Every structure is written in structure tokens, then in C-alpha cells.
Ligand binder design. Structure first.
Ligand SMILES: *CC(=O)N(O)[C@H](CC(C)C)C(=O)OC
Ligand SMILES: [Ca+2]
Ligand SMILES: [Ca+2]
Ligand SMILES: [Ca+2]
Ligand SMILES: [Ca+2]
Ligand SMILES: [Zn+2]
Length: 316
């Protein structure tokens, strides 16, 4: 849409008030002109047909309960872009300021979100397992990070390279949640998962085993479901990433933590420079060590913490 950039206010899924960037042209649209080639949010109207309608509002005020998921998808897509640009110098998911598109209210009681190759899609949940998925900043950044991976390493969605794909999403969605200082933690989807249960999450980075995910290479899932456990085996990597950043002793192997900033820097460098579509866990180790070496020197503590970490999780 062509119009005048303006700023609206709304309430998110969690009931929090925020300003969003909008465009005025008879109606007020959920189109943000300030970021790259724009951030566009659509209404899928409980159907599966994408992207749906560009979100239009009569008064620039988004306080209706139907508005909730749109506010958040729009806003959190903004923060995600900001993180990439500010922290890693990357303009949008393609590095060329490509427009970011999101559709909310996808299907009925749909318990998931996804990057479909060209845009993000967000179900509303069934109201018990999940509430509208775009209310989790880590969920929004996990998904957009799949766009980043597609344009860089291109990790195939299956077996070890898909577990890596999943882990990078989890890593960068956590980094974005810390970046925004939105009650940060090392958990995935805690804000939108099981509105009746407190203190749970979909996956843990600090302790993947809490939910039954492997925290060691010897415990890796060798089957068929979940594209060969792309969401299961990612826990081996998430654990490794957690240890590099925070430190700890895991299975008798001690890791000195080097912090989240440096973790983000080594991982982004591995993703953009060393990983390929077919990379396996052992190639991720090599890619991380080499990124750490490039940045900090072969004899750095950084390099030493990356090796420990992988050693702690049984990767090589
Ligand atoms: C959204 C996506 O690509 N996924 O893989 C999601 C992530 C959660 C919504 C965080 C998923 O974990 O599906 C099982
Ligand atoms: Ca309104
Ligand atoms: Ca949190
Ligand atoms: Ca989290
Ligand atoms: Ca819960
Ligand atoms: Zn994912």
C-alpha cells in the first residue's frame, strides 16, 4: 500500500500495550515503512489460504481481542529485524532488506507457527495447549531465523542438518528474547504454551532432558518421526550452545562460559560462512571452532570453551 507512515497503539496477546508502525491510506494498515522494504501483517481469517488480506483498521487502535495476534506478529517481527541489523549487520533475512510478511489467524485452533519458504504463518492455538503463537517473542524470532538459514547455509530439513536448523532457530530466538529483555530465559515458547500450567515450556536449552530430549549424542534419536527428530535432536546442540554461553559441568566435562554476545557472534559466523545444506553435527563443531578461531585466535579461551562444550555433549 502507498500512504503516510504513522504510529498506532495496540494490546498484544499477553495484554501488554505497545506502539506499532502503520500506514495510512483511507484505512490504517499494518505496514511498517521504517524497516527495509517493510513489515506487512495479514489476516488469514481462519482459513489456510495465504497470505490473506493486508491488515486494515479504521482508527489506528488495535485493542480488540481479534487484533492481539496481529499486533504481536507485527511488533516482534520489527524487533527481530532490529536485532539482526544492529547486532550482526544483516538487513532483513536475505541481507538485502526483503519485505517481511506474516499471516495471523491461520486455520481453526492451529497449534503451531511456521516459515513456509516465503512468509511466516501463525495459528491461534486451541486455547489450551497454546494461545496465539505470535505472543512469544522467541517463537517469532525462531521462525524468522528459518528465513535467515534458508538464505545462508540452507540446511536441509531432515536428520542431523535439520536438527542443526532447528537449534540455530532456538539459539537465535533466545538471543532475540534477551536482546529485547522480555523476561529472558533459556526456554522455548514458555509465554504461549499451556496457559493453564505454570513454569513449563515446549523445550529447554539449559536442560533438554526435562521434556525428554537428548542432552548427549549417545542419546540421539535414530528413527523416522519428526523428519528424523529435527525437533528432538536439536536438544544436543541447544545444550552445547547453553554451555558455551553460561558454563557448567555436564557429564563430568567442565565448560567455562564465554557469554551470550560471543555465542551469537560465533554461531552467526558459522551459519553464514561455514555451514552447508548437508552439514552434520561434527561439521558444526568444526565450523564453530573455526569461527571462534577467526574471531578470537586459536589459543583463545573462546576456542577452548567451544571444544569443551561439544565434548560435553559427545559431538566428536
Ligand atoms: C514454528 C517452527 O518452525 N517450528 O518448528 C515450531 C517452533 C515453535 C512454535 C516454537 C515447532 O517447534 O513445531 C513443533
Ligand atoms: Ca481499531
Ligand atoms: Ca521468557
Ligand atoms: Ca524463552
Ligand atoms: Ca505453560
Ligand atoms: Zn523451527
Amino acid at each position: 500500500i502507498t500512504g503516510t507512515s504513522t504510529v498506532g497503539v495496540g494490546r498484544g496477546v499477553l495484554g501488554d500495550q505497545k506502539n506499532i508502525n502503520t500506514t495510512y491510506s483511507t484505512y490504517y494498515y499494518l505496514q511498517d515503512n521504517t524497516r527495509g522494504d517493510g513489515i506487512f501483517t495479514y489476516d488469514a481469517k481462519y482459513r489456510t489460504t495465504l497470505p490473506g488480506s493486508l491488515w486494515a483498521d479504521a482508527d489506528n487502535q488495535f485493542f480488540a481481542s481479534y487484533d492481539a495476534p496481529a499486533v504481536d506478529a507485527h511488533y516482534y517481527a520489527g524487533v527481530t529485524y532490529d536485532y539482526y541489523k544492529n547486532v550482526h549487520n544483516r538487513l532483513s533475512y536475505d541481507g538485502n532488506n526483503a519485505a517481511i510478511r506474516s499471516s495471523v489467524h491461520y486455520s481453526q485452533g492451529y497449534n503451531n507457527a511456521f516459515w513456509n519458504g516465503s512468509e511466516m504463518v501463525y495459528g491461534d492455538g486451541d486455547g489450551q495447549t497454546f494461545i496465539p503463537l505470535s505472543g512469544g517473542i522467541d517463537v517469532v524470532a525462531h521462525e524468522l531465523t528459518h528465513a535467515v538459514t534458508d538464505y545462508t547455509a540452507g540446511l536441509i530439513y531432515q536428520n542431523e542438518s535439520g536438527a542443526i536448523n532447528e537449534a540455530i532457530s532456538d539459539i537465535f530466538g533466545t538471543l532475540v528474547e534477551f536482546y529485547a529483555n522480555k523476561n529472558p530465559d533459556w526456554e522455548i515458547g514458555e509465554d504461549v504454551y499451556t496457559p493453564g500450567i505454570s513454569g513449563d515450556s515446549l523445550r529447554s536449552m539449559s536442560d533438554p532432558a526435562k521434556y525428554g530430549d537428548p542432552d548427549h549424542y549417545s542419546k540421539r534419536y535414530t528413527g523416522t518421526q519428526d523428519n528424523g527428530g529435527v525437533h528432538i535432536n536439536s536438544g544436543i546442540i541447544n545444550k552445547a550452545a547453553y554451555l558455551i554461553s553460561q558454563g557448567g559441568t555436564h557429564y563430568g566435562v567442565s565448560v567455562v562460559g564465554i557469554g551470550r554476545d560471543k555465542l551469537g557472534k560465533i554461531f552467526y559466523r558459522a551459519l553464514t560462512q561455514y555451514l552447508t545444506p548437508t552439514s552434520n553435527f561434527s561439521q558444526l563443531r568444526a565450523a564453530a571452532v573455526q569461527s571462534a578461531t577467526d574471531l578470537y585466535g586459536s589459543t583463545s579461551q573462546e576456542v577452548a570453551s567451544v571444544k569443551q562444550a561439544f565434548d560435553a555433549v559427545g559431538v566428536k
